[PDB]
Design a protein around this motif. Structure first.
Motif, mmCIF file in Angstrom:
data_model
loop_
_atom_site.group_PDB
_atom_site.id
_atom_site.type_symbol
_atom_site.label_atom_id
_atom_site.label_comp_id
_atom_site.label_asym_id
_atom_site.label_seq_id
_atom_site.Cartn_x
_atom_site.Cartn_y
_atom_site.Cartn_z
ATOM 1 N N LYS A 170 0.833 -1.195 0.000
ATOM 2 C CA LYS A 170 0.000 0.000 0.000
ATOM 3 C C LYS A 170 0.874 1.253 0.000
ATOM 4 O O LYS A 170 0.798 2.100 0.882
ATOM 5 N N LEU A 171 1.739 1.338 -1.015
ATOM 6 C CA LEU A 171 2.638 2.473 -1.196
ATOM 7 C C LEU A 171 2.321 3.318 -2.418
ATOM 8 O O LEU A 171 2.585 4.522 -2.406
ATOM 9 N N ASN A 172 1.771 2.717 -3.474
ATOM 10 C CA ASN A 172 1.383 3.467 -4.661
ATOM 11 C C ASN A 172 0.152 4.334 -4.436
ATOM 12 O O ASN A 172 -0.229 5.080 -5.343
ATOM 13 N N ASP A 173 -0.485 4.243 -3.269
ATOM 14 C CA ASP A 173 -1.678 5.026 -2.985
ATOM 15 C C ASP A 173 -1.390 6.338 -2.269
ATOM 16 O O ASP A 173 -2.317 7.132 -2.078
ATOM 17 N N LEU A 174 -0.149 6.591 -1.869
ATOM 18 C CA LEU A 174 0.186 7.794 -1.121
ATOM 19 C C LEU A 174 0.883 8.822 -2.002
ATOM 20 O O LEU A 174 1.316 8.547 -3.123
ATOM 21 N N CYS A 175 0.975 10.029 -1.459
ATOM 22 C CA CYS A 175 1.667 11.150 -2.070
ATOM 23 C C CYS A 175 2.560 11.767 -1.010
ATOM 24 O O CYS A 175 2.151 11.916 0.145
ATOM 25 N N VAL A 232 18.088 3.243 1.047
ATOM 26 C CA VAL A 232 17.154 3.565 2.119
ATOM 27 C C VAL A 232 16.287 4.726 1.660
ATOM 28 O O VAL A 232 16.798 5.816 1.378
ATOM 29 N N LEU A 233 14.982 4.493 1.581
ATOM 30 C CA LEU A 233 14.024 5.525 1.212
ATOM 31 C C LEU A 233 13.375 6.119 2.455
ATOM 32 O O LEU A 233 12.838 5.387 3.292
ATOM 33 N N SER A 234 13.428 7.442 2.568
ATOM 34 C CA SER A 234 12.656 8.186 3.551
ATOM 35 C C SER A 234 11.553 8.929 2.818
ATOM 36 O O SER A 234 11.806 9.567 1.790
ATOM 37 N N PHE A 235 10.338 8.838 3.338
ATOM 38 C CA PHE A 235 9.196 9.546 2.778
ATOM 39 C C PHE A 235 8.923 10.761 3.649
ATOM 40 O O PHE A 235 8.519 10.629 4.809
ATOM 41 N N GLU A 236 9.160 11.941 3.086
ATOM 42 C CA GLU A 236 9.002 13.209 3.784
ATOM 43 C C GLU A 236 7.680 13.820 3.339
ATOM 44 O O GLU A 236 7.525 14.201 2.175
ATOM 45 N N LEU A 237 6.717 13.878 4.252
ATOM 46 C CA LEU A 237 5.459 14.572 4.002
ATOM 47 C C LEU A 237 5.401 15.760 4.956
ATOM 48 O O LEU A 237 5.308 15.595 6.178
ATOM 49 N N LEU A 238 5.504 16.954 4.398
ATOM 50 C CA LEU A 238 5.445 18.180 5.168
ATOM 51 C C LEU A 238 4.096 18.838 4.939
ATOM 52 O O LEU A 238 3.325 18.443 4.060
ATOM 53 N N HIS A 239 3.821 19.871 5.733
ATOM 54 C CA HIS A 239 2.633 20.692 5.522
ATOM 55 C C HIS A 239 2.892 21.649 4.354
ATOM 56 O O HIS A 239 2.792 22.871 4.452
ATOM 57 N N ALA A 240 3.246 21.035 3.233
ATOM 58 C CA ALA A 240 3.558 21.666 1.964
ATOM 59 C C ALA A 240 2.990 20.781 0.867
ATOM 60 O O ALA A 240 2.694 19.605 1.109
ATOM 61 N N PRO A 241 2.812 21.313 -0.344
ATOM 62 C CA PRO A 241 2.211 20.501 -1.412
ATOM 63 C C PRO A 241 3.044 19.265 -1.724
ATOM 64 O O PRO A 241 4.262 19.339 -1.900
ATOM 65 N N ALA A 242 2.371 18.116 -1.768
ATOM 66 C CA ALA A 242 3.027 16.874 -2.149
ATOM 67 C C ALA A 242 3.436 16.929 -3.615
ATOM 68 O O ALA A 242 2.722 17.484 -4.457
ATOM 69 N N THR A 243 4.601 16.349 -3.920
ATOM 70 C CA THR A 243 5.157 16.413 -5.265
ATOM 71 C C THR A 243 5.517 15.063 -5.870
ATOM 72 O O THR A 243 5.852 15.020 -7.059
#
Ligand SMILES: *[C@@H]1O[C@H](CO)[C@@H](O)[C@H](O)[C@H]1NC(C)=O
Lengths: 198, 218, 213
Positions: free
Chosen positions: A56-61, A182-193
């Motif tokens: 369930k990784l292709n469903d996120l931004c 190693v992948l880090s997924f950074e989701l900030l209170h900024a537009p996902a890209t």
């Protein structure tokens, strides 16, 4: 909207990997990533995700995705996890406890061994203190191990900080070159890209 | 927006001391390695020192070991450089620089404006502002001469900085006497001379000299 | 220390030209080499990180390439707002080190300097000295000769020049010459003038003034 397919080949199928102490990082943004070409590839000995499930990784931004790549020997891949200790985890690459991402490793014996031992791949053997999570240290200052100051290795209690792996294709599997991403997924209170497909 | 603002630059005696400050804003300061990079006047760049995010790890260039000390208070979002045993060779503009990713020893993505540290046994001197009046070919030139000051820098503006077209403020020159001499000119339509008002503003932070000189046709 | 060598030290190209700068490392440093821009009186500009990665908010005409020992920085089309000094920096070890810098200038149409002369101000004479001021405004190429003329006599060893950086608009230069002398020697002589030779001139031009208007 955005149309680019994320350049994971640039990082994975790269010819030269980094020494673990001076590890590399690539920013992955403004593109679409199909993770199924990663956890469904039969190329990886290790694919261990944290805080997320790979299915369930292709469903996120995400705002950004960071890829850290380097080489270690196989017996040390277990150190590339939250809360681990040891030479690599303490002196070269420490992941935090709150880590969110996936850790991918695969045998690179066909690529990183000499006949005679590959001395280009290095790891830090001495440090005055452990690294903070995601801390980096490419210093090569001589390591003082006594009360006496240091100039070069020839001094007493003056050790060279880095140590060579000496990768030979005849080593046991635990001493063989393993490329790690190693992948880090950074989701900030900024537009996902960087988003999954569709 | 990310902001790095440097402060503390001044004139010190050889062997003196000085503490640079870099105020950070716009990002989570405590999670980025910071670095100091200096530039001697008219020379290239030289990395000076690096501190990790928490501050636990510090690195120095050999040319400054044991004299300089990098430090940070993640509380005040401030980076510091404590410089002792200063020499004439440390005379440079000093920038604080952020690590591109924050881990350490990556590209420097953000830089401050710099601060100038002059190390000399000479004494501070405020300048003198002499007007250069036009008498010149459809367009006329006029300017003001900033003479006999030390150290650098002096900031010269025209009409409080509201007049920038045709302005040419020259780099300072070091005269024999060990003092700086600078010139600033502006070209203007010759139909504006006695009609318009043209003010030369000269500001010299080291000598706390603020002078606004009116240039008029003579 | 890894010693980075840049070539060229300085280049001039026409607006829109393709421009290529190389950094030569003293060892194989893989892709550990960033590129910076510094415009006059400003702080450095992170342009390219690692060997080819273009930083956020950087014009697409800038691109890096190379690995190992030879790295290339490329401007696809040179623009007047690119007038700056470009620095390479190595990222493989401490101390982090920079190239000596490369100064980019604009090769443009020849332009002759407008020439202005200024006598010492009446405030300055009280302080006891006199500085004569010749100005060469907005000209290209950079190089030109200024000649000081005290009653047709050649001065030298007593006058200083200063030059601005190429204007980012019309790609021109300006020049201020300041010949200084004591108030005493100012009065004794009478005819002052600067004679300026430039490629954009037919014949050496002279600007003059009369001591005491
Ligand atoms: C690397 O190349 C192989 C073969 O061309 C391909 O199957 C694989 O998807 C590539 N890796 C990435 C990350 O694209």
């Amino acid at each position: 909207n955005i149309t680019n397919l994320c350049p994971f080949g640039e990082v994975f199928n790269a010819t030269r990997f980094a020494s673990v102490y001076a590890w590399n990082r690539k920013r992955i943004s403004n593109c679409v990533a199909d993770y199924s070409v990663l956890y469904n590839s039969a190329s990886f000995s290790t694919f261990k995700c944290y805080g997320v499930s790979p299915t369930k990784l292709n469903d996120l931004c995400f705002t950004n995705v960071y890829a850290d790549s380097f080489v270690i020997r196989g017996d040390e891949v277990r150190q590339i996890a939250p809360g681990q200790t040891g030479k690599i985890a303490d002196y070269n690459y420490k992941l935090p406890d709150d880590f969110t991402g996936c850790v991918i490793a695969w045998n690179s014996n066909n690529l990183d061994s000499k006949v005679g031992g590959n001395y280009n791949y290095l790891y830090r053997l001495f440090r005055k203190s452990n690294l903070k999570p995601f801390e980096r240290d490419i210093s090569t200052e001589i390591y003082q191990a006594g009360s006496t100051p240091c100039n070069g290795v020839e001094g007493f209690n003056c050790y060279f900080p880095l140590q060579s792996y000496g990768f030979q294709p005849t080593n046991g599997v635990g001493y063989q070159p393993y490329r790690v991403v190693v992948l880090s997924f950074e989701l900030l209170h900024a537009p996902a890209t960087v988003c999954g497909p569709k | 927006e990310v902001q790095l603002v440097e402060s503390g630059g001044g004139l010190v005696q050889p062997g003196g001391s000085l503490r640079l400050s870099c105020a950070a804003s716009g990002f989570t300061f405590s999670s980025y390695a910071m670095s100091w990079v200096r530039q001697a006047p008219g020379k290239g760049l030289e990395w000076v020192s690096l501190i990790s995010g928490s501050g636990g790890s510090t690195y120095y260039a050999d040319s400054v070991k044991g004299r300089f000390t990098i430090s940070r208070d993640n509380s005040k979002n401030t980076l510091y450089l404590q410089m002792n045993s200063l020499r004439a060779e440390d005379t440079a503009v000093y920038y604080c620089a952020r690590d591109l990713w924050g881990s350490g020893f990556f590209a420097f993505d953000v830089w401050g404006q710099g601060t100038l540290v002059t190390v000399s046994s000479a004494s501070t001197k405020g300048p003198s502002v002499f007007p250069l009046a036009p008498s010149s070919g459809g367009t006329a030139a006029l300017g003001c001469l900033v003479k006999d000051y030390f150290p650098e820098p002096v900031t010269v503006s025209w009409n409080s900085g509201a007049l920038t077209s045709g302005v040419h403020t020259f780099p300072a020159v070091l005269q024999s006497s060990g003092l700086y001499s600078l010139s600033s000119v502006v070209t203007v339509p010759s139909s504006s001379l006695g009609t318009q008002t043209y003010i030369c503003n000269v500001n010299h932070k080291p000598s706390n000299t603020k002078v606004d000189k009116k240039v008029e046709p003579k | 220390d890894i010693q980075m060598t840049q070539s060229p030290s300085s280049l001039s190209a026409s607006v829109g030209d393709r421009v290529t700068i190389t950094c030569q490392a003293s060892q194989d440093i893989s892709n550990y080499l960033n590129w910076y821009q510094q415009k006059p009186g400003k702080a450095p500009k992170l342009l390219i990180y690692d060997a080819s990665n273009l930083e956020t908010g950087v014009p697409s005409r800038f691109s890096g390439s190379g690995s190992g020992t030879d790295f290339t920085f490329t401007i696809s089309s040179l623009q007047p707002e690119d007038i700056a000094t470009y620095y390479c920096q190595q990222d493989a070890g401490t101390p982090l080190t920079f190239g000596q810098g490369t100064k980019v200038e604009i090769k443009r149409t020849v332009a002759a300097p407008s020439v202005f002369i200024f006598p010492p101000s009446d405030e300055q004479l009280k302080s006891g000295t006199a500085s004569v001021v010749c100005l060469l405004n907005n000209f290209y190429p950079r190089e030109a000769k200024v000649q000081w003329k005290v009653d047709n006599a050649l001065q030298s060893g007593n006058s200083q020049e200063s030059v601005t950086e190429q204007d980012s608009k019309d790609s021109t230069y300006s020049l201020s010459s300041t010949l200084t002398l004591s108030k005493a020697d100012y009065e004794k002589h009478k005819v002052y003038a600067c004679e300026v030779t430039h490629q954009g001139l037919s014949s050496p031009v002279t600007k003059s003034f009369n001591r005491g208007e």
